[PDB]
Scaffold this motif. Structure first.
Motif, PDB file in Angstrom:
ATOM      1  N   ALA C  16       0.939  -1.169   0.233  1.00 31.70           N
ATOM      2  CA  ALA C  16       0.067  -0.071   0.001  1.00 31.70           C
ATOM      3  C   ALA C  16       1.029   1.179  -0.008  1.00 31.70           C
ATOM      4  O   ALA C  16       0.491   2.059  -0.626  1.00 31.70           O
ATOM      5  N   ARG C  20       1.036   3.778  -3.145  1.00 30.58           N
ATOM      6  CA  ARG C  20       0.561   5.513  -3.016  1.00 30.58           C
ATOM      7  C   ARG C  20       1.974   6.234  -3.442  1.00 30.58           C
ATOM      8  O   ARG C  20       1.692   7.195  -3.947  1.00 30.58           O
ATOM      9  N   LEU C 223      -5.388  -7.322  -3.245  1.00 27.46           N
ATOM     10  CA  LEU C 223      -5.527  -6.109  -2.279  1.00 27.46           C
ATOM     11  C   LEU C 223      -5.474  -4.907  -3.053  1.00 27.46           C
ATOM     12  O   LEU C 223      -4.638  -4.304  -3.707  1.00 27.46           O
ATOM     13  N   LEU C 224      -6.634  -4.008  -3.304  1.00 27.82           N
ATOM     14  CA  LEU C 224      -6.775  -3.008  -4.019  1.00 27.82           C
ATOM     15  C   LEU C 224      -6.025  -2.050  -3.607  1.00 27.82           C
ATOM     16  O   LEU C 224      -5.526  -1.073  -4.225  1.00 27.82           O
ATOM     17  N   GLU C 225      -5.673  -1.882  -2.226  1.00 23.39           N
ATOM     18  CA  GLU C 225      -4.980  -0.868  -1.704  1.00 23.39           C
ATOM     19  C   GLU C 225      -3.430  -0.813  -2.065  1.00 23.39           C
ATOM     20  O   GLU C 225      -2.718   0.346  -2.181  1.00 23.39           O
ATOM     21  N   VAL C 261     -14.602   1.288 -10.662  1.00 20.29           N
ATOM     22  CA  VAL C 261     -13.256   1.176  -9.958  1.00 20.29           C
ATOM     23  C   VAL C 261     -13.552   1.494  -8.623  1.00 20.29           C
ATOM     24  O   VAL C 261     -13.975   2.809  -8.186  1.00 20.29           O
ATOM     25  N   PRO C 262     -13.536   0.542  -7.719  1.00 24.92           N
ATOM     26  CA  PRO C 262     -13.668   1.013  -6.398  1.00 24.92           C
ATOM     27  C   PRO C 262     -12.569   1.734  -5.820  1.00 24.92           C
ATOM     28  O   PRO C 262     -11.566   1.874  -6.195  1.00 24.92           O
ATOM     29  N   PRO C 263     -12.988   2.670  -4.728  1.00 22.46           N
ATOM     30  CA  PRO C 263     -11.968   3.819  -4.391  1.00 22.46           C
ATOM     31  C   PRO C 263     -10.919   3.610  -3.588  1.00 22.46           C
ATOM     32  O   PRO C 263     -10.066   4.342  -3.164  1.00 22.46           O
ATOM     33  N   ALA C 264     -10.817   2.223  -3.032  1.00 20.27           N
ATOM     34  CA  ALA C 264      -9.597   1.752  -2.410  1.00 20.27           C
ATOM     35  C   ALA C 264      -8.420   1.726  -3.230  1.00 20.27           C
ATOM     36  O   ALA C 264      -7.194   1.781  -2.774  1.00 20.27           O
ATOM     37  N   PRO C 294     -11.746  10.442  -6.403  1.00 21.28           N
ATOM     38  CA  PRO C 294     -11.563   9.278  -5.400  1.00 21.28           C
ATOM     39  C   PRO C 294     -10.025   8.509  -5.297  1.00 21.28           C
ATOM     40  O   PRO C 294      -9.957   7.942  -4.465  1.00 21.28           O
ATOM     41  N   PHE C 295      -9.274   8.757  -6.451  1.00 18.00           N
ATOM     42  CA  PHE C 295      -8.123   7.905  -6.758  1.00 18.00           C
ATOM     43  C   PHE C 295      -7.481   9.226  -7.521  1.00 18.00           C
ATOM     44  O   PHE C 295      -7.814  10.042  -8.172  1.00 18.00           O
TER      45      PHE C 295
END
Ligand code: G3H
Ligand code: G3H
Ligand code: G3H
Ligand code: G3H
Lengths: 348, 348, 348, 348
Positions: C16, C20, C223-225, C261-264, C294-295
């Motif tokens: 993660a 980022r 894991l999308l994060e 797209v999920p925002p995680a 959101p991303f």
């Protein structure tokens, strides 16, 4: 349109004809495709050193057995053996062809854990598969084999959705690639016997797995007329103190197939999966007493054809004749079982 | 666990026994379940007023035909008819029972457009279905029918994924609900003949649809031993100037079934879907010349059993005897076709 | 249970944090992972011989550009380059680390036709992937990339169901394997611009594809994060005479992502897919004028960062300074576009 | 093509505008749609006879509360109430409109066991839904609600695959039908708290369920811009002696949404599912301290807005003023919680 392009009629005809030859009445497959590490185990049980020469001696012992083609329609080989010569210098494929046994080749690259599962397995090997198939066809293989493995564990929810989805996907891709290269794919989704579950649990899981497998085969444009299925029989788990009766195993196995397998498939060639030589024959025989069936029910046996042959050989050259006699006894028993004629040796 | 609870053995036995009775050799289903609006069309073609009395007269004409049970194993009814009396006061179900014909009931509530599709149809009727099934069983029905409809249109990508998914879902839910209420479900995914597509396009679409349907039946815990399939035959589109030969229709229809339908299903009861009376018989006959098959191939015909019966009746009472004679001729033809004995009247 | 085992918190934290860092504001990825055959094409456009020395010279030109890390957060490498030294003997990874640029590695093995499709492509490379990931991590890679390719062709129904299913499966397996080996997976489902379809068709297909991809990621416990998406922008087909406006491309691209797209997920790093250097910057800039999002919406550009750098280099050593200046101009433009600050150089 | 036809821009605009009005900052939904049998329970807890007059009195007490529209954006009604008049003769919808509260309507027909599951539930009501939606829109409803229910039971493998598939299918069909009739669908997949599972189990199940739901919404062409989600918060099971902290519930709830919900959805309106009035407010408040979020996180509360209002009313008319004061206190608390401003009253 969006549908599958038409398979070549010429290729489809070859695949269908070879699949029916493999699933021939009164015959089945000798599974002799133990990898280097698996054959070590088999050899360790009789204390024999796993030299290339010993492997060549043993495979020659199997394949040069006179009259073996009366009961064996095909022989699954490991890659080494496909390109190997007997100790006397005869290519292994030539021994097979002399008996009219069709050579086949194991093409998967083994098992790998699916991330974040409890040691549930993907089957690897699609990379380079199409090119490998071409070479194996030129070397004389006309069918292939790919083993996937699932586990029953009710407490852990095995087989999980991801396990079943992965097994089905890999088998479908592999089967379509084989057929594009003129090899009949044997589709082997093996549900292991590990655990203490009942035969009815094995039946439920087998049905779910086969339903998923055959839907995926359809999705990937696999020609059922030119394919074969190699499933587990439906049995109690291996930790059960009481083995299911041959009548029960036959009933639940046939039921699970008839509930999931479209009858365009020419043959179901069972794995023996740890059963004794005699149980493997008796269970198949019992299924073929309750025929005739919409597809051939037969065998693709490794241990159940070789166990006593190995113990009779003991790595000792001089025992070669006796070892081949033992192999013939088991080949005959299972060919007779295919016809429901082996004499020993409805729930919804 | 996470798997389907076991179906009641007593219920499963009843369903399986009744499904096999419906799929009995030399017999098939009379589809007489035209709704009020559909029977209007049929009556409009012969200029008859759609009074309740006329409907009662006609259904009595059909069901009181002496000897009809030699060739008809079951009769699909509309709800009105299930609870109706003949003009002479005999309940329709009693006419059926006197011939040993099993009563069946249409239980869907018709078609509704799926939002944001090009007029592709969902089948409605799950709400209250379980309670309706109970009442219909008490009234004497032992099987049910639910019609879903798909269209072929290559330019529009029909049938779309959503169409197929919806059709499969509704059929699977309906079938499981029926079986919970002791009714054998007839699963009818009708691919319409509309369009100018070739028989090979019909074959591809039929295979995709049936693969999806049977996977959904498995997902919903439907007992195939106690169900029946009512599919379209595989044919050219209705806008084609040249109708496919009976040999072609038979080959592609059998092929599509054998590629998708598990052989635990006892019977495939074809809809006639606009074919002439004689074509419907000849096509079925041709399929049963190429037997024996893993399931019974038979008929569930509406128009193909009634067309000439209607034209002979003409709404005129006095023509009742002649009309029943015509119906018997067609029932006999299709019973004989079921056996591959009607005398007229491999591509991968 | 039956659910995914918990990912290691330590591994998840690393993934993660690195995802980022790659999706850092005002920065994006330099895609310099052209294989030997792809870099030939790029070199052919400026008439340069594809020697290992020339490749080493060019990659060193890119990665030794002073100040590049102000705008580039990560650099995708081909395997050769990961283990290569500049002409002066400095390992390529060391040039990257000196600028604080995270090294990444392309891990797919290219494309192969899916049998019986109209040249639709599977991405190969899962075999040995887990072991490769371990070695690449030890060599300094902290993220990976896997390219899948889909085509739009309404007349042929492309992308077909099998294409989308295969793309999603391979990406999900690859992503889970990467994360098990501490590499952030870049998930690249590229819908090619080939054809004359409208931007609204691209939007519909992109939504369907991303919906399938993200469902498969969820199924495989990704894991999308700790992952990144590298999609096509939503544009007209490349055969269209009129390119969509930057405002239109921005609107439909953002809409397609927000619908699927999920925002995680921390970052969407667009491929430039044939766009001009200036279009790639202007389109990204336009999306980030309509933020905050959101991303992070940013770039993973190959051609759109290197085109003018190549033409300025011309294979001539002496042009190295000028070439790096050009690269910096484009890196700055796209970093500014990430912030919606580049100054040039609702439909449901 | 094969894709969804374009939704009407005019209809889509209305749906999106009304969904954003319902998900308005500092506001949420009053769930007052208790059926006749459910309101009996609520009334039984305070010993009040379930006459139509009492229901009319209570709903009027709620909806005529002065100033309620400061905190309540919409009110979900039962069909009876939509067409009902207060005791003083004012239509209930007119009380709502006077406060600027949007009327909504529950449109499902309740729950039915899925055959051969361990009492897992399908939601019924698609039959006639489209026609009902039209009438409800004419009566003043602008949004709808459909409740599906899932259970966690690790020993029984609940929720099973069939449960999740059915829940997703019904919600997707319902949502598309609503949007075709200009009603914003509230999508309510409620995972019940029954059992002693941990919050991490609730999180895993919620993620799996929402992933399936949103994939099905995409499959059915549901416009996320014009829909709302009403999920359970992520909590320990109700048999756990220790309730999770508000910080934990907030973290796992937000995480589960961000991992599965595309950010085009305008609002997530939580059900309170048995929580106390104060817990429901504190948990929502905690989520909105950790904002800003990609969608509005708010409330659609029944018990958590009405519990104390009922106990203060006691069926006694004279307590009407005090009861409305209590309702306002809870509406204010939850409106403030929506903003993360209520003052009381990373794991991968
Ligand atoms: O059941 C099939 C084969 O015996 C498995 O061989 P293998 O262990 O080398 O994969
Ligand atoms: O094919 C089945 C039935 O004839 C259809 O009857 P229906 O039009 O009333 O649904
Ligand atoms: O878009 C991603 C890469 O540029 C593709 O590289 P490749 O052609 O070697 O697969
Ligand atoms: O959570 C939503 C509603 O309170 C459920 O109402 P119902 O019990 O009448 O279906």
């Amino acid at each position: 349109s969006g549908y599958g392009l038409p398979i070549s009629q010429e290729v489809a005809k070859e695949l269908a004809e070879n699949a029916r030859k493999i699933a021939a009445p009164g015959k089945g497959i000798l599974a002799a495709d133990e990898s280097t590490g698996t054959i070590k185990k088999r050899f360790d049980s009789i204390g024999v050193e796993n030299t290339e020469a010993n492997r060549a001696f043993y495979r020659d012992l199997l394949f040069s057995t006179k009259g073996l083609g009366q009961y064996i329609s095909g022989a699954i080989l490991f890659e080494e053996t496909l390109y190997q010569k007997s100790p006397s210098g005869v290519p292994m494929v030539d021994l097979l062809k002399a008996e009219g046994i069709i050579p086949g080749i194991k093409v998967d690259k083994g098992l790998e854990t699916l991330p974040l599962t409890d040691d549930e397995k993907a089957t690897m090997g699609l990379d380079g598969l199409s090119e490998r198939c071409k070479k194996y066809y030129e070397a004389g293989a006309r069918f292939a084999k790919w083993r996937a493995v699932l586990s029953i564990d009710p407490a852990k929810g095995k087989p999980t959705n991801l396990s079943i989805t992965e097994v089905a996907h890999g088998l479908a891709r592999y089967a379509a690639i084989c057929q594009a290269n003129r090899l009949v794919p044997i589709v082997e989704p093996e549900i292991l016997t590990d655990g203490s579950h009942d035969i009815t649990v094995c039946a439920e899981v087998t049905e779910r797995v086969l339903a998923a497998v055959f839907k995926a085969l359809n999705d990937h444009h696999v020609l059922l007329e030119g394919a074969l299925l190699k499933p587990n029989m439906v049995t109690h788990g291996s930790d059960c103190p009481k083995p299911a009766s041959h009548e029960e195993i036959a009933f639940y196995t046939v039921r699970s197939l008839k509930r999931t397998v479209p009858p365009a498939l020419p043959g179901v060639m069972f794995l023996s999966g740890g059963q004794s030589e005699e149980d493997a024959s008796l269970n198949l025989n019992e299924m073929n007493k309750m025929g005739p069936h919409p597809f051939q029910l037969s065998f693709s046996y490794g241990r159940a054809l070789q166990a006593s042959c190995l113990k009779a050989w003991k790595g000792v050259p001089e025992n070669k004749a006796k070892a081949q006699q033992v192999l013939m006894e088991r080949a005959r028993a299972n060919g007779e079982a295919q016809l429901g004629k082996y004499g020993g040796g409805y729930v919804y």
